[PDB]
Amino acid sequence: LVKNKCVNFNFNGLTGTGVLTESNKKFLPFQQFGRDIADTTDAVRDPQTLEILDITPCSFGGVSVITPGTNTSNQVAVLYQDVNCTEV
Amino acid sequence: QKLIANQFNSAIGKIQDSLSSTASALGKLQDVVNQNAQALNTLVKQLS
């Protein structure tokens, strides 16, 4: 397994995507995963390591462009909504 | 003038008291937050 890179994971059949982080969430030795609401599998314990991880889906947002018009120019900006300036 | 200024100054004082003490003083603003967030909740529950 890897961490902090959003991967097409497959833990025991649970097929998804997202970044995996170490968990502080107190599992119990008979708990396999957690879902906060709406079947959102939020955490999961790997089958081999027995280590619990959190799953946050890798960042996404809308992209909206800022144009001055067409007859005025063709130069534009681009806004990556609610994304930290670390991705493309 | 002097008394009128006191009534006005005093009336303003009771406002924050009536606002701070009595909860449910902002019933109107709280609904538009409650409803509009309750409605979002049902939207997600429907994914399950």
């Binding site: 959102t40 889906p57 947002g61 | 003083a25 937050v33 939207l43």
Partner: peptide, 24 residues
């Protein structure tokens, strides 16, 4: 601002208001 009790999952979002509160 203390007497009220104002999170995204999938497709949901909350655009921020244009007039910030310290402008309002």
């Amino acid at each position: 601002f203390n007497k009220v009790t104002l999170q995204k999952f999938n497709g949901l979002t909350v655009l921020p208001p244009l007039l910030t509160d310290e402008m309002i």
